Amino acid sequence: IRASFDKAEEPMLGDYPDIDPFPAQLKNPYKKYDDQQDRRNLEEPLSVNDDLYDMWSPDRFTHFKNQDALKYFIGFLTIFFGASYVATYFVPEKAAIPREFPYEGLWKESGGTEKSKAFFGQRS
Amino acid sequence: GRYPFPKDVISMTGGWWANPSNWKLNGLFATGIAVGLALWVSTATLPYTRRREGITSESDISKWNAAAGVWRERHGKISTGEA
Amino acid sequence: YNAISLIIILPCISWLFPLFFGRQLGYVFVTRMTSTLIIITTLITYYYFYQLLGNNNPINLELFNYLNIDYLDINYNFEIDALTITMLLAITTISSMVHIYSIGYMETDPHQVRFFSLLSMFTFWMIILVTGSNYFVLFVGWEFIGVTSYLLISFWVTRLQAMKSALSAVLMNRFGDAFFVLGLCVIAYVFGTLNYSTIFATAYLINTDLLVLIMLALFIAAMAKSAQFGLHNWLTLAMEGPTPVSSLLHAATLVTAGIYLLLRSANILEYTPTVLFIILWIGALTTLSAGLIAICSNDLKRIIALSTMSQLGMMTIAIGLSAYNLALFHLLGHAFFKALLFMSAGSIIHSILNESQDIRTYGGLLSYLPYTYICITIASLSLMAMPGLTGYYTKDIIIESTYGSYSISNYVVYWIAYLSAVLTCVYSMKILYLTFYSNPNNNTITYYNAHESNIYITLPMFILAIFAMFAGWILKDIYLGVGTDFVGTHILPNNFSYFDTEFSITQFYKLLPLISAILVSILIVVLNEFFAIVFNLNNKYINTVYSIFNQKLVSDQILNHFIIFKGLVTSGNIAHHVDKGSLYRLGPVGINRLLNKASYNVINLSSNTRSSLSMNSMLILITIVSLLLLVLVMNVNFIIVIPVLISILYILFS
Amino acid sequence: ILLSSLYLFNRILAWQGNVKHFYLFASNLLLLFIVVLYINFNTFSNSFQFNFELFNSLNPFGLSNSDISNGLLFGIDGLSLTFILLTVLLIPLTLLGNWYNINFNSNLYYTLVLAIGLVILLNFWALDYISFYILFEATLPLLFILIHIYGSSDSERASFYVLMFTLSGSLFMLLSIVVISIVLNTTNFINHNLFVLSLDLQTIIWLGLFIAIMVKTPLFPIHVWLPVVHSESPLAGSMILAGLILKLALYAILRLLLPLLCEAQILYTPMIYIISLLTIILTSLATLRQIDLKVIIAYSSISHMGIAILGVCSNTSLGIYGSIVLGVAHGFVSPALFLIVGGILYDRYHIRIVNYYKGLTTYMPQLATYIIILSFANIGTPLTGNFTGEFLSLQGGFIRNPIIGGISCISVLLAAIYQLKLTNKLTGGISSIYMHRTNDVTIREKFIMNILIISTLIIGICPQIMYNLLYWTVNNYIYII
Amino acid sequence: HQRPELVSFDDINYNDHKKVREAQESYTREQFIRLEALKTVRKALEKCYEESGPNHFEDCKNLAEQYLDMLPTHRLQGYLGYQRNDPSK
Amino acid sequence: AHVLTKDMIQERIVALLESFDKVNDAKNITATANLTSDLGLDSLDVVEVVMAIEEEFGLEIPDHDADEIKTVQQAIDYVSAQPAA
Amino acid sequence: LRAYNEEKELALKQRLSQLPPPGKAFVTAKEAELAELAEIAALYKTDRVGILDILLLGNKHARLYRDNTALLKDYYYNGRRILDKIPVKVTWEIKREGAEKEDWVNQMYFLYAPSLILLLIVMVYKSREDITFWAKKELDQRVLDKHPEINDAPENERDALIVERIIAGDYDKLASLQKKAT
Ligand SMILES: CCCCCCCCCCCCCCCCCC(=O)OC[C@H](COP(=O)(O)OCCN)OC(=O)CCCCCCCCCCCCCCCCC
Ligand SMILES: CCCCCCCCCCCC(=O)OC[C@H](COP(=O)(O)OCC[N+](C)(C)C)OC(=O)CCCCCCCCCCC
């Protein structure tokens, strides 16, 4: 009943109980059940989408709402990446020149050819 | 500690706290088979062992590169980046 | 006596013999036998490493053919070289220690034959993973260690949460393996082979777009294996398995395979400077996120696992700097003290009657467990890169490389890495204080019964404590030496900068991480012992941000609601609305309904009539007249008659 | 001989009253005979070897020694020998998997099962379009009767599906075969690559052949009959339908389509890739929301068949070799999974709903180990023939079209998901409250499962062992100028 | 060791099936010989790399280039393309 | 390992109650004493005591079962009913 | 092998006739009747006839023996299933360890399994005549026929020289077969 996908099935039942679904993980685990691990009692009706609400379904997190958690996750990524990118601007310059190598950058040692020295060849 | 368990349930792994009464004799058999297997494997795979370097001579390597150059000159083959 | 053959074949026996003979042998013999086999493997490995440092001429073992189809020739080939021997040092040492530790730690458990067979299985397949000489053998090991991880995380089968944790791990690593298969297809197409020799022979001539495609797929695979911030979630769930499993998986072998896959590919990765960049910044993100989550966690194993995540991020940063030797050395060093941390945590947990893992539920144990204190202390100070310890010689130089890197922008990484480092101290001290210094938080009987563990637990911790004090210093020249040629990876000369990162470094940067570590460690301890309010405030906003960090930067919710749950809803839509909806409509259900109406209409064409003669005569007249008029229409224009015939069919059948 | 052997059959039936021991003996002899044929098969030759003709006008009841060929032709090359070996390996196992659970009217049941096996085996020997089509259709009434009389609760709808869908596709194949017959006045497979039809007529003939392929494989979107038919069939029916009958479609692609309609096939390949990618992705996702064990296992076959299609239509040697290897490995592993769900669990509990099953490891550790092994084999763990087939098929697909094959690489994940989701619940957790403890797997069930696992492991470790029969085949059908 | 005589599609009449079969087998066998040549080049390249190490870029340049050149042209291609098409026209 | 006995549970609970300052008297604490009546413990005070009991024997009392225990003997039989404590 | 006896059979029928139907023949769970059930059920595994009589005799004897065996099998298996005791040893012994062969074992273990082993052996040794080996040898022979002097060279030099010649020259004949492509 509660979610959009359980509602969408409402035309698809005729004479099947319209069960309001509750995630089995959120049932209090100190009550007693015929199957304690699944937190189910015998002959208990199943929602049409029961496979998405039983104990083997993906875990549900209660502390935050899903929307707010999305806000926090996007915000963390945004602030981290934006801060790093901005920091790239305010950077000191190095003090030593990048090193160099004999034979025009050892272009022969890294394969290379007379006719093709830009492809293979170091800073020389 | 421990608890009851069904005795009819036969598992290749032994089940619950499997500690057979004749385990020392069975262990002697198992270690003998282990030693035999390891030594057979170590000896049989010996001919397929080799070192990585110094197995082909400079003559072969140099002449193979020369022949490949010959092949690439018979065809029209420029080098990478050579344009 | 062939070292390579024995190194492969002995863990195979320690794996398979328990499965064949467990009921006949019993867990007493099986535990002792598997441990002995792994010990002999470790000794053979150490001897091989000694000789290889003598003479860097790797052994190859070339066996039967796997595939010899059109141009693709794949063989079961193995080699032990410098990279492989470093991996094997970690793998075999930690595996032998974990095997010895498990005799004590699992003594009560009914199912010890299966457990020890699985630990040996993991060792064997990881050895296969690192010793293979082509990407196919690597993949064989890659998939089998995933299978073994599934069997280990779900070892306690009756526990629902453990089974779900195992499903998480196996599925996220199958996502990685899907990208691995993509990469293998690209590699086989572009290079005609999977052998390392040929790919490293010709990779410098290859088109760069193709190399980026290959390396990107391989990096997504390694990302899932090494729990970078994309696909980390299973790493902390893996703490559902028994503690010795966590010691093996998070220190030596499983989470290191990703790093290995990048290290083995360094020759290709030199020519893909774009994916090196992505690797670098992914690692910076990973180390930051891991440290932040760790500061706000209360489960001991979870904090240690998040520390593993931060260290893997640090190795990935090193890879992205092309200081592959640095990442390799940090992998090898991190394995030892991470294994020690996990084993010490296992001791602490077994020292409580409740066997609670909540750091909020210990609190005075220094007097009661001095030896576990000293082991965990040594491991922590190794992690914090304190002077003269193994972690110093790896962590600090990796931190400094970022400043010394030629790429200017990489300076930002320095600060990120540094923050991670100090963040590390904060959680280490937090578990050190809350476990040993604080004030007792458990009830009185636990302190009465709090004792140390047996020799089977204690001896491995002693051995790994020695390792975590001495290995880094005794090995620094092999991996970080001014011109060491042991790991022979071909670093492009323009890229190589290990000299610049030593000569160009100033006192401020070379000293600031160390001083910050020392100062923060003292700060955390003194603020806990004297100003508990600053940590134990009650601000609504701070509690909110703390809650964010405590729930893994809500990542696990984000994955579970927006991908996995959405995916199951979409699967329901496909299975009900398409497979059992539209497809049955253009199928048995729709055709049945159609034929029912059509048949009813045609049989009732003469339904209500009473005199069959009159009706049938009217039908013959109507037929004749209609045929005449239809043919007249056809003579006029045949197209005009098509609608009329459609209408007549509609009249008859509908 | 035939007279004497018929007397033997009659007397055995008179005295024992159960025909099944005789059928097991006959099928085992057939397997040995095929192995002897393989011994005398020349591999350095791409020509059909053990040829014979039936129903020639000069000898309607014998073998044809005439200079005019107007009967039905039979013979084998390496490709057909591969599938024949798979068939004769599987038939005795399908007899043995129903040894004890068929009690009323069992002689008819075993007769139907053996007849279906023999018809498929003959189908792989057929050397012309008409003989192929005849043996292709002849299984449908036998399957209809078998499913209707010996299937589970919904077996009437299932028998009607297995007849009607397959007839539907086969009649369009029949249109194509009639067109070939009247246009070429020849129908045989020995020289049909020598006839080059105009591109337009090729394009038309291809459509009928491919509609039949789409229903028989099956491919999206005409697959929905297979889960029903598999779910309601008795065990031997399911084993034959998943292990053998679906392979007839792959064989049909290689034997009937590629040699004759080469240019049209080139033109149509992107459409095939669309259909196969849809099959893989959509059926893999639809499996996630199934609640019947046998339905889940049945849905798995469709995705693996999609991968095989992508391989076999890749115009590469690696892709065709991968498609054939995948077909064989699936023929090993899928009958084993059907044995587990519809032979072992169903004979103990007589129910297939997933909610009832949980934590079988406690009382049945051996069955749980079999489940784990067969699951990781089914999702393509390396050293299994399934991995070799899938990997080579994806290589060929990626070469044929990098984007489409690259996206196809997600099947690794998707298959892992549905299969391991099932096995996680089957083995883990506390023993279910709804079922009582039963026996662990028996000696017969273990024997069947062991045969299948050893076969898939042998071709997984050394796939090259099939190459001596197939190296001509991986070049016979690619079209490169 | 067998050495069947080589037959070309361009010479034969497609109505002698023996000649057509021989032409198909000849085409396939020649492709497999080409694959053998490529494998020889690749094996030499692997040996050169493993004995050269850091100077493989110099000592194996010809082998690397030749392997990469022969990779696209020395694979299996079938016979149907050539038998069903006449290149002259 | 470690195993508790009914008398150990009783001795721990009695020492626990003796430590509480809100109690009427220490000498009057019986096995079948009522905390509400004999010890005169408030509504919230018995809650504090149940919380102390669960913090002492390392278990977790649900709301419905916490409010049910009214006597010390009830507490002891509850704590002995629980396997891990 | 001939083992039939009509004299025994026509009396076995009546020895069956006294007993209750095998469905209800053990539903008590006296011991004398159970002992006779044990003996008569033990007759199921005492094979009563061989080949020379099924082939030669007639269908009335066959129908009777068939019926007898039907009821014997029912008695044996029902006693085994309810009591948990094998009907040998002759009063219903418990000794289930061993001495229990199913009717499929001989076929599947001495015909089917050896056939599969033979198939594996045949595939292994058939793979030796694979095209990859033939083409290796053929390339070598073509090189040796074009350049016979590398025959004069010693063994260990020879293979390196064949490799050299292969690398340098395009010894295939694919383009030769492509006559019309000029
Ligand atoms: C109702 C469905 C439609 C029915 C239409 C088709 C009905 C066919 C009836 C089945 C009969 C076919 C099998 C028997 C024919 C083979 C007899 C034979 O001798 O094959 C000839 C072939 C060459 O022999 P030859 O030239 O004489 O030289 C011998 C040198 N020593 O020698 C060989 O190379 C051996 C050939 C082996 C062929 C394997 C056959 C496997 C199956 C045999 C029984 C199949 C029964 C199927 C029953 C269901 C109906 C389909
Ligand atoms: C079980 C852990 C590993 C144990 C390894 C011990 C090896 C000792 C001797 C090895 C000799 C060897 O493998 O040779 C393999 C021989 C000939 O190969 P080759 O070309 O002459 O040389 C190989 C080395 N080359 C190429 C570098 C020179 O062909 C075979 O037999 C393969 C037969 C396949 C049988 C079907 C597979 C059955 C799988 C059964 C799975 C349960």
Alpha-beta content class of chain A: mainly alpha
**Would you list the SSEs of chain C in sequence order as H and E?**
HHEEHHHHHHHHHHHHHHHHHHHHHHHHHH
How much helicity do the residues of chain C have? Answer: over 70%
Number of strands of chain C: 2
Helix-strand sequence of chain A? HHH
Rg over alpha carbons of chain C: 33 Å
Q: State the end-to-end distance of chain A.
A: 73 Å
Oligomer: part of a larger assembly
Strand content of chain C: under 5%
Q: Based on Cα principal axes, name the global outline of chain A.
A: elongated
Q: Tell me about the largest β-sheet of chain C.
A: 2 strands, antiparallel
The CA-CA distance between the termini of chain C, in Å, is: 88 Å
Q: How many H/I helices of chain C? A: 28
Strand content of chain A: under 5%
Question: What percent of residues of chain A adopt helix (DSSP H or I)?
Answer: 25-40%
What's the total helix number of chain A?
Answer: 3
Quantity of strands of chain A, as a count: 0
Largest interface: C-D, 56 and 54 residues
Keywords (chain G): Oxidoreductase
EC number (chain G): 1.6.99.3
GO molecular function (chain G): oxidoreductase activity
Organism (chain G): Yarrowia lipolytica (Candida lipolytica)
What is the secondary structure topology, with strand pairs?
This is part of a larger assembly, with seven protein chains of seven kinds.
Chain B: H1 23-44, E1 49-51, H2 58-74
Chain C: H1 3-25, H2 27-54, E1 59-69, E2 72-80, H3 82-105, H4 112-131, H5 135-153, H6 160-191, H7 196-202, H8 208-225, H9 234-237, H10 243-251, H11 254-264, H12 266-269, H13 273-295, H14 300-320, H15 324-350, H16 370-383, H17 390-404, H18 411-437, H19 444-449, H20 455-479, H21 500-503, H22 507-530, H23 532-535, H24 540-550, H25 555-585, H26 588-603, H27 612-636, H28 638-653
Antiparallel strand pairs in C: 1-2
Helix pairs in contact in C: 1-2, 1-4, 2-3, 2-4, 3-4, 3-10, 3-15, 3-20, 4-5, 5-6, 6-8, 8-11, 10-15, 11-14, 11-15, 13-14, 13-18, 14-15, 14-17, 14-18, 15-16, 15-17, 15-20, 16-18, 16-20, 17-18, 17-20, 18-22, 27-28
Chain E: H1 17-52, H2 56-59, H3 61-70, H4 80-83
The complex binds 1,2-Distearoyl-sn-glycerophosphoethanolamine (3PE) and diundecyl phosphatidyl choline (PLC).
Residues 50, 52, 54, 63, 115, 118-119, 121-122, 125, 134-135, 138 of chain D line the site of 1,2-Distearoyl-sn-glycerophosphoethanolamine.
PDB class: oxidoreductase
Keywords: Complex I, NADH dehydrogenase, Mitochondrion proton pumping, Ubiquinone, Oxidoreductase
Entry title: Cryo-EM structure of a respiratory complex I
Give an account of the 3D structure.
The structure is cut from a larger assembly and holds 7 protein chains of 7 kinds. With 83 residues, chain B is mainly alpha-helical. Chain B has 2 helices and 1 strand; from the N terminus they run H-E-H. Chain B has helices at 23-44, 58-74, and one strand spanning 49-51. Chain B is elongated, with a radius of gyration of 31 Å. Chain D has one domain (1-481). Chain D has a 3-stranded antiparallel beta sheet with strand order 2-1-3, with no helix packed on it. In chain D, strand 1 (52-56) and strand 2 (59-63) form a beta hairpin. Chain D is globular. In chain F, 51% of the residues lie in helices and 0% in strands. Chain F has 4 helices and no strands. Chain F has 85 residues and is an all-alpha fold. Chain F starts with 5 loop residues before the first helix and ends with a helix. With 182 residues, chain G is mainly α. Chain G is built from 8 helices and no strands. At the C-D interface, strand 1, helix 5, helix 6 and helix 25 of C face helix 11, helix 13, helix 15 and helix 17 of D. Strand 1 of chain B pairs antiparallel with strand 1 of chain C, so a sheet runs across the interface. Bound molecules: 1,2-Distearoyl-sn-glycerophosphoethanolamine and diundecyl phosphatidyl choline. Diundecyl phosphatidyl choline sits between chains D (457-458, 461-462, 465) and B (41, 44-45, 48). It is classed as oxidoreductase. The entry lists the keywords Complex I, NADH dehydrogenase, Mitochondrion proton pumping, Ubiquinone, Oxidoreductase. The entry is titled "Cryo-EM structure of a respiratory complex I".
